[PDB]
Ligand binder design. Structure first.
Ligand SMILES: [Mg+2]
Ligand SMILES: [Mg+2]
Ligand SMILES: [Zn+2]
Lengths: 87, 129, 155, 184, 150, 81
RNA sequence: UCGGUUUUUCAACCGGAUCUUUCCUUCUGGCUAACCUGUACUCCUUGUGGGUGCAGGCGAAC
């Protein structure tokens, strides 16, 4: 990771799934990045500006990916009461 | 028979983590268990945990951030003799940089580093990384 | 132990070199010699006031308590004036990092100054060899009454 | 007669309280005979945020049942008289420390005299007309315990705006952080 | 998960949170105590008494209202039996089985069951001796058992 | 699934769950004020009887025992305590 | 400062004394170190900077 002379070693720092906090590996051909665009007035959807969510393959495989995504959305306010904390 | 409660708790936590859950429901709850949890919290392996009062044994709800990759009790609480801690560390922990061996000393329940600092040893409990 | 009579066998049993001058009559009539064993232990009133004899008593006899002082639970009272003490301990087997439960019976001498039942915990002091197996002499009996105060359940 | 309903009587607040109690005897049948067999083991006033100052009125323990039977009306009266302030009837309880492995065995410590039990009792006393349902204990990431006490959907109107005050009192007493809640 | 069968059930009473007397219940603890004493005099076991209290009267649990468990109360008054209730019941059961066996001999299942019962009794006896509720020498046999029962 | 508030769940869900298996154990049974059609007396009958509970003054039998919840004697009228 | 060495701004870390409803085994005495003192009040910058000094008495200093 960190060398004694301050400077970084570590060839690349990996992405962690925004739902589990678990690391996504390099040959994780199942994992995903969802880009949800920043909206404006009159809708219009601001070009080249978005909220990104990484999902590990594992969650997707399991099935509780959609739910996780929903949860993520309803903490950045992209959805308004779809997911409830108390189930 | 529920021979060990702490062990059960730890196993439950592990199960929760592996399946990706963000919260556990530990069911018998003790002093020792609480202490163990606190150590983890201090080291940042766990979020906020809370103790429900049943008026009988207890029940703990634990929030998991996702950083904790294994708990684990080492069961027959072996009497570890200061110079012996190192061997245990070598065995149980995945590296020499991080991870903690939790051991109950007369100075209280702590991780091995803390014990070393304080210069105390006792019976082993578990490990976290 | 003794159990009654005192002057009960073929020879007259007296404390050696203790003289009770049968001319000028004393209060006790017969003089009783005793000593405190030391080590913080107390000579019981049963020993001072009693009429029993014993050479092998640590209070009223000739033996001296020195060396090791052990403790353990009483297993057998059956043989006269002596006792058997069980002494449970843990033997550490290093290969398996664990402990064996172990045993060792210590035969010990019981001064008639004591009431000893099977199961009482007893403090025993080392002395001069007394018989083939006995090296130890009972100093303190810890189980005093058990539940001799309130034995019956009725309030 | 003031100094006779006090166990031992120094201070001025205590005297005032006694006087108030005496005055309250002029309600007659509901607030006499039952009020006549009552005393204090001193009174401590605790500063609460906002300007209010709560009144921890310490009480023997065999007397407590009687107090409970009487309490609410009496408390209200006190409040009316001693304006702005809240009056809390806590029982004076012993607490005996843990017999340290070195110390002398002073005969078995009763489990009512254990600290936790005492604390629980105090808590019970504090919210009197409202019973306690669930208890939660939040252990925070920072490293400090916050207790969470759940109460009935009934009785609440007796307890109203006193909750902060109660919390403050608790803090003063033990040094533990409390949060009160009403689930429905 | 059960002590002599393969059974794994979890059926049990679930005691409520509040130790305090229920808000709707009036009466008095003294009254309850008196009632309990009366019941004892009449000739009932603790459990039965408790059941009665639960049903005919407003008593949820005796410890909730009085401050004490029923057995304790009985003891205090001097009414708790020579043999603890459960043990007595077990003994009675055993005796019945024995009687049955005496009558018909080829009942092997019954015999097997009897053994289990005996074992249970022994366990209970051991427990009691340790706690010193029974006199520390009390043993269970056949004729003696019958006598105890009757 | 994955993320839940385990501490305060939905009431309906709790109700659905078995007694004991709830967050804190609590009885599903309750007590009843039983009015017998004849005399003006109120008896407090537990909903899961076992015993054939009669009025304290007159023998009438208010409840008969069943597997779980006890059955009331038709002429009787109850009110939940 | 003559590659080493002293404090402060600061830290985490390991202790110690306490006070919190808290005794830490308790006295029968030896030494009571000390001032809780105040007996004459002042060697003295306008002072509570400082100490020759002994009847009541803190004992942890053994
Ligand atoms: Mg089971
Ligand atoms: Mg078995
Ligand atoms: Zn009728």
């Amino acid at each position: 990771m960190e060398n004694d002379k301050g400077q970084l070693v570590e060839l690349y720092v990996p992405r962690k799934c925004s739902a589990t906090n678990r690391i996504i590996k390099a040959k994780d051909h199942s994992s995903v990045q969802i880009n949800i665009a920043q909206v404006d007035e009159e809708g219009r959807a601001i070009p080249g500006e978005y909220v990104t969510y990484a999902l590990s393959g594992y969650i997707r495989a399991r099935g509780e990916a959609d739910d996780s995504l929903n949860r993520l959305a309803q903490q950045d306010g992209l959805l308004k009461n779809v997911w409830s904390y108390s189930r | 028979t529920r021979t060990s409660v702490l062990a059960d708790a730890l196993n439950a936590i592990n199960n929760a983590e592996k399946t990706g859950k963000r919260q556990v429901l530990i069911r018998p709850s003790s002093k020792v268990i609480i202490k163990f949890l606190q150590v983890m919290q201090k080291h940042g392996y766990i979020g906020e945990f809370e103790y429900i009062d049943d008026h009988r044994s207890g029940k703990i709800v634990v929030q998991l951030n996702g950083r904790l990759n294994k708990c684990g009790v080492i069961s027959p609480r072996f009497n570890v003799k200061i110079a012996d801690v190192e061997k245990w560390t070598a065995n149980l922990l995945p590296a020499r940089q991080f991870g903690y061996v939790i051991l109950t000393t007369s100075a209280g329940i702590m991780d091995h580093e803390e014990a070393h600092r304080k210069h105390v040893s006792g019976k082993i409990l578990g490990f976290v990384y | 132990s003794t159990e009654l009579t005192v002057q009960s066998e073929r020879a007259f049993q007296k404390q050696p070199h203790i003289f009770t001058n049968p001319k000028a009559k004393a209060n006790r009539k017969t003089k009783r010699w005793y000593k405190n064993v030391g080590l913080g232990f107390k000579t019981p009133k049963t020993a001072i006031e009693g009429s029993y004899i014993d050479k092998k008593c640590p209070f009223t006899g000739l033996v001296s308590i020195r060396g090791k002082i052990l403790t353990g639970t009483v297993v057998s009272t059956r043989m006269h004036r002596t006792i058997v003490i069980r002494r449970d301990y843990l033997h550490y087997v290093p290969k398996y990092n664990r402990y064996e439960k172990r045993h060792k019976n210590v035969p010990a001498h019981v001064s008639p100054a004591f009431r000893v039942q099977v199961g009482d915990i007893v403090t025993v002091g080392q002395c001069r060899p007394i018989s083939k197996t006995v090296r130890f002499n009972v100093l303190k009996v810890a189980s005093a009454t058990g539940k001799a105060n309130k034995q019956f359940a009725k309030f | 007669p003031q100094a006779k309903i006090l166990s031992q009587a120094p201070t001025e607040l205590e005297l005032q309280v006694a006087q108030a109690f005496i005055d309250l005897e002029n309600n007659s049948p509901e607030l006499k005979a039952d009020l006549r067999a009552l005393q204090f083991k001193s009174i401590r006033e605790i500063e609460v945020a906002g300007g209010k100052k709560a009144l921890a009125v310490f009480v023997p323990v065999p007397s407590l049942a009687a107090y409970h039977k009487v309490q609410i009306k009496l408390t209200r009266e006190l409040e009316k008289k001693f304006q702005d302030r809240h009056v809390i009837f806590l029982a004076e309880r012993r607490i005996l420390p843990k017999p340290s492995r070195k110390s002398r065995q002073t005969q078995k410590r009763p489990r009512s005299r254990t600290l936790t039990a005492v604390h629980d009792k105090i808590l019970e006393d504090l919210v009197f007309p409202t019973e306690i349902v669930g208890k939660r204990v939040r252990y925070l990431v920072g490293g400090n315990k916050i207790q969470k006490i759940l109460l009935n959907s009934k009785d609440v109107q007796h307890i109203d705006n006193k909750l902060e005050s109660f919390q403050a009192v608790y803090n003063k007493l033990t040094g533990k952080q409390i949060v009160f809640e009403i689930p429905s | 998960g059960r002590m002599h069968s393969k059974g794994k059930g979890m059926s049990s009473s679930a005691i409520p949170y509040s130790r305090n007397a229920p808000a709707w219940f009036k009466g008095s603890s003294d009254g309850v105590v008196e009632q309990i004493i009366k019941y004892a005099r009449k000739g009932l076991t603790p459990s039965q008494i408790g059941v009665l209290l639960r049903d005919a009267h407003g008593v949820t649990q005796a410890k909730v209202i009085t401050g004490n468990k029923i057995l304790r109360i009985l003891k205090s008054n001097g009414l708790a039996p020579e043999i603890p209730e459960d043990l007595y019941f077990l003994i009675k059961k055993a005796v019945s089985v024995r009687k049955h066996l005496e009558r018909n001999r080829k009942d092997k299942d019954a015999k097997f069951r009897l053994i289990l019962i005996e074992s249970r009794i022994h366990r209970l006896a051991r427990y009691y001796r340790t706690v010193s509720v029974l006199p520390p020498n009390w043993k269970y046999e056949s004729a003696t058992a019958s006598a105890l029962v009757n | 699934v994955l993320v839940q508030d385990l501490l305060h769940p939905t009431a309906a869900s709790e109700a659905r769950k078995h007694k004991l298996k709830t967050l804190v154990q609590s009885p599903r049974s309750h007590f009843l004020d039983v009015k017998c059609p004849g005399c003006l007396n109120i008896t407090t009958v537990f909903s899961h009887a076992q015993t054939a509970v009669t009025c304290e003054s007159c023998s009438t039998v208010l409840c008969t025992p069943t597997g779980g919840k006890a059955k009331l004697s038709e002429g009787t009228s109850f009110r939940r305590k």
